[PDB]
Write a protein that binds this ligand. Structure first.
Ligand SMILES: CCCCCc1ccc(-c2ccc(S(=O)(=O)CCO)cc2)cc1CCc1ccccn1
Length: 229
């Protein structure tokens, strides 16, 4: 029990309530990119002339579990093996063995100024509501304030609320018979000002690239390892 336990529970619960819902029938979501099972949607939202566009994506990855996907997403030690848009990150504080606070800087995208982020990252297993329902693994990354926040005069502080939410279907169980269903949501306030066209182009390019790359890394690192359910 660190000082964020209840904020964490609230963020996680909101994601389980709202983020998991299907949006196939919801015209409010614009489907922007589809590549097979990977479906990437946005809402066009601006606040004070700053693009906030909520991002929501679903995906189905063979041969990995939600537990594996989330560990890989959460574990700072493999971060540099799949991240492409990060200049630097530092663990600011270890809250618990499933929760840390991270500082990171994002590669500049011309012509906007560089962004940095300060966020709590927590991984949690949500037990099946009923023996009918799936268990879910979730990673939530959400912005928090912290005293040990670096001075970075090059950077505008973005604020994020991101969740990677995983449920695993299975048919000795082999990788051949396991499917991981992902819902990934990212609400990012870039702060300051950045050209709308830039923000939307970066999102449209980088989210599908991230999801394809990250999931493929998980498949590759796990294949021929015992399944971690
Ligand atoms: C002018 C560019 C402004 C960049 C704004 C920004 C800042 C941070 C993020 C971002 C994206 C994914 C995460 S995470 O999924 O939690 C994994 C940990 O890194 C945390 C933060 C996103 C974005 C929006 C632009 C953009 C979109 C997808 C990739 C990169 N940049």
């Amino acid at each position: 029990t660190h000082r964020f336990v209840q904020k964490v529970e609230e963020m996680v619960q909101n994601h389980m309530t709202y983020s998991l819902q299907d949006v196939g029938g919801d015209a409010n979501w614009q489907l922007v990119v589809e590549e097979g099972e990977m479906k990437v949607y946005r809402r066009e939202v601006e606040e004070n002339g700053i693009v906030l566009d909520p991002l929501k994506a679903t995906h189905a990855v063979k041969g990995v579990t939600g537990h594996e996907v989330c560990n890989y997403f959460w574990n700072v030690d493999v971060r540099n093996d799949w991240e492409t848009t990060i200049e630097n990150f530092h663990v600011v504080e270890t809250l618990a063995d499933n929760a840390i606070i991270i500082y990171q800087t994002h590669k500049r995208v011309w012509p906007a100024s560089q962004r940095d982020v300060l966020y709590l990252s927590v991984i949690r297993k949500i037990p099946a509501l009923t023996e009918n329902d799936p268990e879910t693994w979730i990673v939530c990354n959400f912005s928090v304030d912290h005293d040990s926040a670096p001075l970075n005069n090059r950077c505008v502080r973005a604020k994020i609320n991101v969740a990677m939410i995983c449920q695993t279907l299975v048919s000795e169980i082999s990788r051949d018979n396991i499917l991981c269903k992902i819902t990934y949501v990212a609400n990012v306030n870039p702060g300051g000002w950045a050209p709308a066209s830039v923000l939307r182009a970066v999102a449209k390019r980088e989210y599908p690239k991230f999801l394809k790359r990250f999931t493929s890394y998980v498949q590759e690192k796990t294949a021929g390892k015992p399944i971690l359910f």
